[PDB]
């Protein structure tokens, strides 16, 4: 099966440069041309550029809005995709997806990477502190948990409930920032005969600090 | 370059309806040699990549479901999609590869459903945060509908370091959640005894209020 996975995200000052990388796997990767595509947080796709396959002599395209600045090569011997960004400015903050693109016949981007976040900024890396949301000692057969995870930069950050084996019944609120750092909070809502009896534990990760946190939701009393 | 529009910018839908929405380019798009058209429907649903739904304007990829329709040539653009499911909550992006590529700027697709009464929740500051010298009240405004709603915080029956946010619709039910989060210091926490989340949405005149009492923690 095709695999399409971006690393090299993070956060990158005004100016820097960076290169993301795609490793891919499960078709034959000299066939492929390969396409760098980005997205702004709530804004649309923009392709940004693509490098042709060994057909076509594995040569470069950009689009007018990167060409001069980025590059992308890629390693046949691998199977893997880069993209090199120089001068970043804070509106190249983006989500960057590699995708498959043309085989020399068919006109279609196959398969899509999961995304590396890009933000650029002169803000510091802050950990997130993580804080467990418990009914209070006065608060049914639904019970509602949840964590805090409070003024960390840059984004992303991942929570998941039990390791991810508790997803339905799950919100994760999108983060918001307030004067310099992201705020976010998770919800997750089981049946009541199941916690405190059952444990109930949120992970959350943030990339940006290497940052693993398990945060047991424990009873107020009990 | 090529000039990729779509419309409209959003829509909502019940399920089991039709849904058409429209794609054009600056260009012809219709390849003279091979005779197709190339434009593509892509379905992004929130917080994940984009996936393949339709290439060469009318060729449904495969483990695409065949309510999904694109049609047209040239430079107008049509995807349609019969019968509806609350899944199929996406932004729809087309894109044209007869020049490079370039994308179109979205069609976002939300879902209308029944009025539905959020369940509130309410949490009081963890020792762990009190410790540090803060006090984040936190209260959940889950699965209503529609989105909009009104949150306020009272303390000791005082309407007054507010976060809000609001998830994208929710893909099973079509319906949305909204967290609200009171952040104080602990001096100012430790004044006050009655925190309060009210919650005010068409689905009642009488607000559902969540509250606790410090000393009861
Ligand atoms: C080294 C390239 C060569 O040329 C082409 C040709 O027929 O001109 C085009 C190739 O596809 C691209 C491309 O520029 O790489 O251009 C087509 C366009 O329609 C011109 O036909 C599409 O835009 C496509 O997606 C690519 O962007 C390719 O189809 C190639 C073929 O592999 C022959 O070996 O021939
Ligand atoms: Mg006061
Ligand atoms: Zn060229």
């Known amino acids: 099966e095709v695999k399409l996975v971006e690393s090299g995200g993070g956060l990158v000052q005004s100016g820097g440069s960076l290169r993301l990388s795609c490793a891919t796997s499960?078709?034959?990767?000299?066939?492929?041309?390969m396409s760098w595509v980005r997205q702004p947080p709530g804004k649309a796709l923009e392709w940004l550029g693509f490098?042709?396959?060994?057909?076509?002599?594995?040569?470069?395209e950009y689009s007018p809005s990167v060409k001069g600045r980025f590059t992308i090569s890629r390693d046949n011997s691998q199977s893997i995709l880069y993209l090199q960004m120089n001068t970043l400015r804070a509106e190249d903050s983006a989500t960057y997806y590699c995708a498959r693109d043309h085989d020399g016949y068919y006109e279609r981007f196959s398969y899509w990477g999961q995304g590396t976040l890009v933000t650029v900024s002169a803000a510091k890396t802050t950990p997130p502190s993580v804080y467990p949301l418990a009914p209070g000692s006065a608060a049914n057969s639904m019970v509602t948990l949840g964590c805090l995870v409070k003024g960390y930069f840059p984004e992303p950050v991942t929570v998941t409930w039990n390791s991810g084996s508790l997803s339905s019944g799950v919100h994760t609120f999108p983060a918001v920032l307030q004067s310099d750092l992201y705020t976010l909070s998770s919800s997750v809502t089981v049946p009541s005969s199941t916690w405190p009896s059952e444990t109930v534990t949120c992970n959350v990760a943030h990339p940006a600090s290497s940052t693993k946190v398990d945060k047991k939701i424990v009873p107020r009393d009990c | 370059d090529i000039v990729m529009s779509q419309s409209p910018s959003s829509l909502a839908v019940s399920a089991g309806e039709k849904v058409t929405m429209s794609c054009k380019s600056s260009?012809?798009?219709?390849?003279?040699?091979?005779?197709?058209?190339?434009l593509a429907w892509y379905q992004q649903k929130p917080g994940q990549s984009p996936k393949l739904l339709i290439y060469?304007?009318?060729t449904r990829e495969s483990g695409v479901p065949d309510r999904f329709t694109g049609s047209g040539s040239g430079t107008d653009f049509t995807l349609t999609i019969t019968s509806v499911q609350a899944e199929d909550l996406a932004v729809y992006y087309c894109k044209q590869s007869y020049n490079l590529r370039t994308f179109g700027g979205g069609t976002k697709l939300e879902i209308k459903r029944a009025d539905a009464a959020p369940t509130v929740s309410i949490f009081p500051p963890s020792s762990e945060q009190l410790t540090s010298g803060g006090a984040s009240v936190v209260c959940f405004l889950n699965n209503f509908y529609p989105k909009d709603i009104n949150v306020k915080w009272k303390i000791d029956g005082s309407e007054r370091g507010v976060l809000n946010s609001w998830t994208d619709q929710d893909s099973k039910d079509s319906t949305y959640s909204m967290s609200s989060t009171l952040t104080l210091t602990k001096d100012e926490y430790e004044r006050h005894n009655s925190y309060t989340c009210e919650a005010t949405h068409k689905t009642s005149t009488s607000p559902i209020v969540k509250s606790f009492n410090r000393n009861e923690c």
């Open positions: 260009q012809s798009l219709l390849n003279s040699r091979t005779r197709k058209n190339y």
């Open positions: 490098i042709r396959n060994k057909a076509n002599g594995y040569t470069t």
């Open positions: 499960g078709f034959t990767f000299t066939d492929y041309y």
């Open positions: 060469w304007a009318s």
